[PDB]
Write a protein that binds this ligand. Structure first.
Ligand SMILES: N=C(N)c1cc(-c2cccc(NC(=O)C3(Oc4ccccc4)CCCCC3)c2)cs1
Ligand SMILES: N=C(N)c1cc(-c2cccc(NC(=O)C3(Oc4ccccc4)CCCCC3)c2)cs1
Lengths: 236, 5, 236, 5
């Protein structure tokens, strides 16, 4: 690791600077370096890690979708043969995306999840594990696709079980986990009814717990509740 | 696409 | 060059795909590979090259400005010492920016400019040479800053001389060259009056030649004329 | 910042 000689605190400081500069690849590299120092991550640090890689992989996913769409059109009846280039370049972006996902999954497995004992850390990391297997599933087409899907499902399910036992229904990590697991059901697992049920139950149970919250906590929880509602509106 | 966070 | 084994036509095809996917680093790498095949570039190919590196360096410049601003605040009276990290990371981004500029300038020097005989190619490349020395000037602070500025000035001036002899005043390359040389005067050379004079004369001479143009040529020329006017409004 | 193209 090229960050091995940099202080942990300096890596975290530079991750925050990279964020302000919208340099998310740098941000991710700094936070990978910080994780590899071997200490547990604080709440702020976990979110720096997640923001960085979410932005990096999000851009890869958007590019992959553009190229996949072009590739699918090149294969319709009537298209002129353009050669191997569209497939090659889609494969290039795909392989880079898989590499980023494997990197994040590797950090979670060595050794963030096994040292995470508090609900807020363990659920956070298991959600990430589900998310990055979900991104692998989005591009998967081979002998391993079912197993990738089941790896996402299993991580999301463990996170869900912990979150229902240990966090209130308005907890933003619990809400975001449910939002994403619901999308997993709809888009990956071919289970739209499960997706809709999960989003609705999550929304309704959160609604009933809003009365316990401060104004600032209310703002955070209702933001994600609105995303649940947005998806329900898309799907119904 | 649907919303995730 | 890692693109040495890829066909020229495939590199150009993939540059266009990268553009559609907003993968401008890839686009620039593909177009560098195409230039290094040694053949002259067509009009479309020149613009693919320019779009790619403009987007890459534009993002670097935006990040550099964010970090420079943070660095300057850290050095005001009253600031708490944050350590070397802001300077280090600004330097990191700066060095990467300089590297990209040096790469583009190297392509122009080996051997795009020397083989460019037509006005539309030679002016295009000399404008690029001025632009990338201008970006180097934006971050320059040492013994070489005056020489970097003079290198930008000299490239812009040769481009201007050719464009006035060989292109009509509405030619979009001529207009864009004048726009950028005017910004060079205002922002780099501490010559706001020269910047304003150049923008106004360019605008007025273009206005008087619009009557010769087709509807599509009119749209292109008036777009850049509006940028000249926008700058004049900012500066007066 | 001013416009360039
Ligand atoms: N970027 C940065 N420098 C920083 C971000 C934070 C920070 C601190 C607490 C919670 C959060 N965020 C969350 O716990 C989640 O995101 C939310 C999104 C909307 C509302 C509430 C939370 C919950 C859902 C999954 C993704 C994380 C971040 C500190 S510093
Ligand atoms: N991106 C792409 N796949 C492609 C871009 C092109 C293409 C073809 C002709 C002219 C241009 N552009 C220009 O000559 C300039 O830009 C213009 C900007 C506004 C109006 C007119 C021109 C003139 C000013 C300096 C920068 C180049 C591009 C083909 S393909």
């Amino acid at each position: 690791g090229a960050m091995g000689s940099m202080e942990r605190a300096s890596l975290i400081q530079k991750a925050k600077l990279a964020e302000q500069a919208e340099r998310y690849e740098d941000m991710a590299a700094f936070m990978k370096g910080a994780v590899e120092k071997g200490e547990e991550l604080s709440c702020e640090e976990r979110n720096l890690l997640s923001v960085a890689y979410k932005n990096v992989v999000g851009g890869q996913r958007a590019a992959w979708r553009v190229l996949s769409s072009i590739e699918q059109k090149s294969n319709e009846e009537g298209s002129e043969e353009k050669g191997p280039e569209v497939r090659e370049y889609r494969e290039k972006v795909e392989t880079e995306l898989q590499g980023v996902c494997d990197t994040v999954l590797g950090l979670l497995d060595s050794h963030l999840i096994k040292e995470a004992g508090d609900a807020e850390s363990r659920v956070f990391y298991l959600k990430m594990k589900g998310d990055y297997y979900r991104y692998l599933a989005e591009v998967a087409t081979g002998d391993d696709k079912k197993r990738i899907i089941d790896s996402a499902r299993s991580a999301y399910q463990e996170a869900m079980d912990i979150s229902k036992k240990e966090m209130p229904p308005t907890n933003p990590i619990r809400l975001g986990l449910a939002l994403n697991f619901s999308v997993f059901h709809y888009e990956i697992a071919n289970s739209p009814e499960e997706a809709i049920s999960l989003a609705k139950t999550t929304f309704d149970e959160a609604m009933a717990d809003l009365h316990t919250l401060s104004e600032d906590s209310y703002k955070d929880s209702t933001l994600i509740m609105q995303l649940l509602r947005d998806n329900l509106t898309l799907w119904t | 696409f649907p919303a995730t966070v």
